[PDB]
Design an enzyme around this catalytic site. Structure first.
Site, PDB file in Angstrom:
ATOM      1  N   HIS A  62      -9.295 -19.541  63.611  1.00 27.09           N
ATOM      2  CA  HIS A  62      -8.595 -18.613  64.511  1.00 27.09           C
ATOM      3  C   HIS A  62      -7.102 -18.850  64.585  1.00 27.09           C
ATOM      4  O   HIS A  62      -6.645 -19.993  64.557  1.00 27.09           O
ATOM      5  CB  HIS A  62      -9.196 -18.662  65.912  1.00 27.09           C
ATOM      6  N   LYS A  72      -2.135 -24.666  71.183  1.00 25.54           N
ATOM      7  CA  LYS A  72      -3.366 -25.144  71.815  1.00 25.54           C
ATOM      8  C   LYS A  72      -3.377 -26.673  71.854  1.00 25.54           C
ATOM      9  O   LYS A  72      -3.084 -27.327  70.851  1.00 25.54           O
ATOM     10  CB  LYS A  72      -4.569 -24.628  71.020  1.00 25.54           C
ATOM     11  N   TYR A 132      -9.236 -26.468  76.156  1.00 24.51           N
ATOM     12  CA  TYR A 132      -7.923 -26.411  75.549  1.00 24.51           C
ATOM     13  C   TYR A 132      -6.887 -25.689  76.386  1.00 24.51           C
ATOM     14  O   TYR A 132      -7.177 -24.631  76.947  1.00 24.51           O
ATOM     15  CB  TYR A 132      -7.970 -25.885  74.111  1.00 24.51           C
ATOM     16  N   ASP A 171     -17.010 -14.240  63.758  1.00 20.66           N
ATOM     17  CA  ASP A 171     -16.655 -15.230  62.727  1.00 20.66           C
ATOM     18  C   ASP A 171     -17.424 -15.067  61.405  1.00 20.66           C
ATOM     19  O   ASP A 171     -16.894 -15.374  60.322  1.00 20.66           O
ATOM     20  CB  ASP A 171     -16.790 -16.654  63.287  1.00 20.66           C
TER      21      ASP A 171
HETATM   22  C1  LIG Z   1     -10.587 -16.696  72.986  1.00 23.82           C
HETATM   23  C2  LIG Z   1     -11.108 -15.965  74.206  1.00 23.82           C
HETATM   24  C3  LIG Z   1     -12.395 -15.433  74.227  1.00 23.82           C
HETATM   25  N1  LIG Z   1     -12.808 -14.784  75.337  1.00 23.82           N
HETATM   26  C4  LIG Z   1     -14.167 -14.251  75.449  1.00 23.82           C
HETATM   27  C5  LIG Z   1     -14.551 -13.045  74.595  1.00 23.82           C
HETATM   28  C6  LIG Z   1     -16.029 -13.316  74.270  1.00 23.82           C
HETATM   29  O1  LIG Z   1     -16.896 -12.641  75.226  1.00 23.82           O
HETATM   30  C7  LIG Z   1     -16.191 -14.845  74.373  1.00 23.82           C
HETATM   31  C8  LIG Z   1     -16.210 -15.568  73.019  1.00 23.82           C
HETATM   32  O2  LIG Z   1     -15.056 -15.130  72.276  1.00 23.82           O
HETATM   33  P1  LIG Z   1     -14.714 -15.769  70.836  1.00 23.82           P
HETATM   34  O3  LIG Z   1     -13.321 -15.159  70.321  1.00 23.82           O
HETATM   35  O4  LIG Z   1     -16.050 -15.603  69.952  1.00 23.82           O
HETATM   36  O5  LIG Z   1     -14.452 -17.305  71.267  1.00 23.82           O
HETATM   37  P2  LIG Z   1     -14.336 -18.574  70.254  1.00 23.82           P
HETATM   38  O6  LIG Z   1     -14.736 -19.821  71.162  1.00 23.82           O
HETATM   39  O7  LIG Z   1     -15.071 -18.262  68.861  1.00 23.82           O
HETATM   40  O8  LIG Z   1     -12.720 -18.551  70.023  1.00 23.82           O
HETATM   41  C9  LIG Z   1     -11.896 -19.702  70.160  1.00 23.82           C
HETATM   42  O9  LIG Z   1     -12.075 -20.446  68.951  1.00 23.82           O
HETATM   43  C10 LIG Z   1     -11.252 -21.598  68.732  1.00 23.82           C
HETATM   44  C11 LIG Z   1     -11.725 -22.279  67.439  1.00 23.82           C
HETATM   45  C12 LIG Z   1      -9.792 -21.156  68.713  1.00 23.82           C
HETATM   46  O10 LIG Z   1      -8.896 -22.269  68.581  1.00 23.82           O
HETATM   47  C13 LIG Z   1      -9.477 -20.401  70.018  1.00 23.82           C
HETATM   48  O11 LIG Z   1      -8.153 -19.863  69.988  1.00 23.82           O
HETATM   49  C14 LIG Z   1     -10.433 -19.240  70.272  1.00 23.82           C
HETATM   50  O12 LIG Z   1     -10.156 -18.210  69.309  1.00 23.82           O
HETATM   51  O13 LIG Z   1     -15.055 -15.327  75.109  1.00 23.82           O
HETATM   52  C15 LIG Z   1     -11.981 -14.691  76.425  1.00 23.82           C
HETATM   53  O14 LIG Z   1     -12.361 -14.069  77.530  1.00 23.82           O
HETATM   54  N2  LIG Z   1     -10.743 -15.189  76.414  1.00 23.82           N
HETATM   55  C16 LIG Z   1     -10.309 -15.843  75.330  1.00 23.82           C
HETATM   56  O15 LIG Z   1      -9.093 -16.344  75.356  1.00 23.82           O
END
Ligand SMILES: Cc1cn([C@H]2C[C@H](O)[C@@H](COP(=O)(O)OP(=O)(O)O[C@H]3O[C@@H](C)[C@H](O)[C@@H](O)[C@H]3O)O2)c(=O)[nH]c1=O
Ligand SMILES: Cc1cn([C@H]2C[C@H](O)[C@@H](COP(=O)(O)OP(=O)(O)O[C@H]3O[C@@H](C)[C@H](O)[C@@H](O)[C@H]3O)O2)c(=O)[nH]c1=O
Lengths: 198, 198
Positions: A62, A72, A132, A171
């Site tokens: 990401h 982060k 984070y 992803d």
């Molecule tokens: C990233 C994020 C997700 N969400 C919500 C949307 C979804 O319903 C749920 C999961 O979203 P995802 O994008 O699949 O989360 P994720 O846990 O796969 O994404 C995270 O991955 C890390 C590896 C990165 O460093 C981060 O920056 C972030 O992108 O969380 C938020 O409300 N706020 C946020 O800031």
């Protein structure tokens, strides 16, 4: 706290001073003075996120478009994750390279990922909790994905147990590194250095 | 995210929006927009602390001299703690009173404790991990203690197995509320009012 710059410039592994007693333990996860000492500026904490993942879950890769992208400061407070940072800054002397750290509830290390880098982790145990600090609030239009198993990036994920990792639909549908390069969304090395320079 | 002000004004219980999926879960612990919505200003994160405690460990009661004191945005990321806030602000319409929030890795609530309040928690399980964002860096001179079991404050700690709390040497030596009142170290209500008002 000790801070060691990774092989990908602009990412650091932080080691806490853990104070142990009969009650349990205590550490300062971040201090403004400690952060400034390695980063050269204060961390403007605009959001703090938390995720919990089962063994074999891979979240990533990401990034956030520049500007302002999203720095982060990342740690694991239960279980353990194999954490990776990838240099996606076009023109970087280390473009396309990656480094890793083990974030866990034993040594309680941290990775700081500066603006314009890509980041991901693979959970090594069930109930692995990651927290984070973020330099920018959630912006789903400016946050993007790169296939974590991209063959050019060739990240050496210690798959559990060599079994395919478990990914979100997002992803699993992540475009190739090649496709992301064609999109114009990647930050430029010159732009990122200038931005952090300011 | 929903914020409910406690019976002690200037302290809030925050309930997260938890996003559950195949991988585990994700939540935005703090957002700038969400924090401003209840607190009326942005949280200036200058330090972040982490402690891990065994069952029956009590940490508190702690406060920081105003100004600038130290606001705390507190959550439990593993196990569970009974978290208490006490109104130690001389002249407050609720002086000497307390309220509590159950912080755990199930409902994943947060308490926000504004400047000039006292705070403590009792760990209810082993390996209970508490993380908190701070508005000020550690200041040993201006951070002070009140005996957690003070008879006037009469905090109803749900003692683990009914047993006496396990305290640090610092918390076990903490003066009575009476002594603290006589010391001049407590903040005034309208002092906290104009400080947070500004
Ligand atoms: C990233 C994020 C997700 N969400 C919500 C949307 C979804 O319903 C749920 C999961 O979203 P995802 O994008 O699949 O989360 P994720 O846990 O796969 O994404 C995270 O991955 C890390 C590896 C990165 O460093 C981060 O920056 C972030 O992108 O969380 C938020 O409300 N706020 C946020 O800031
Ligand atoms: C609060 C604090 C303590 N310390 C140190 C002193 C000790 O060596 C070790 C543990 O300190 P103690 O005062 O026993 O930690 P503690 O966990 O009893 O203290 C905390 O309790 C919370 C309930 C309060 O709300 C917090 O403000 C804080 O005071 O860490 C720091 O280094 N930085 C800090 O910011």
């Amino acid at each position: 706290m000790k801070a060691r710059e990774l092989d990908v410039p602009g990412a650091w592994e932080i080691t806490p001073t853990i104070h142990v007693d009969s009650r349990g333990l205590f550490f300062e996860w971040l201090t403004d003075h400690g952060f400034r000492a390695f980063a050269g500026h204060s961390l403007d904490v605009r959001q703090v996120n938390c995720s919990v993942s089962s063994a074999g879950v891979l979240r990533g890769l990401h990034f956030a478009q520049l500007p302002p992208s999203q720095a982060k400061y990342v740690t694991c407070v239960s279980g353990s994750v194999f954490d990776v940072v990838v240099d996606i800054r076009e023109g970087s002397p280390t473009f396309g390279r990656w480094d890793s750290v083990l974030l866990d509830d034993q040594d309680r290390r941290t990775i700081y990922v500066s603006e314009g880098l890509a980041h991901g982790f693979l959970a090594l145990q069930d109930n692995s909790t990651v927290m984070y600090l973020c330099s920018a609030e959630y912006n789903p239009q400016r946050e993007h994905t790169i296939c974590a198993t991209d063959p050019t990036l060739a990240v050496d994920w210690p798959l559990v147990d060599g079994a395919a990792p478990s990914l979100s639909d997002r992803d699993a549908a992540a475009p190739s590194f090649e496709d992301v390069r064609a999109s114009g969304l990647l930050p430029r090395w010159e732009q990122t250095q200038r931005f952090i320079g300011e």
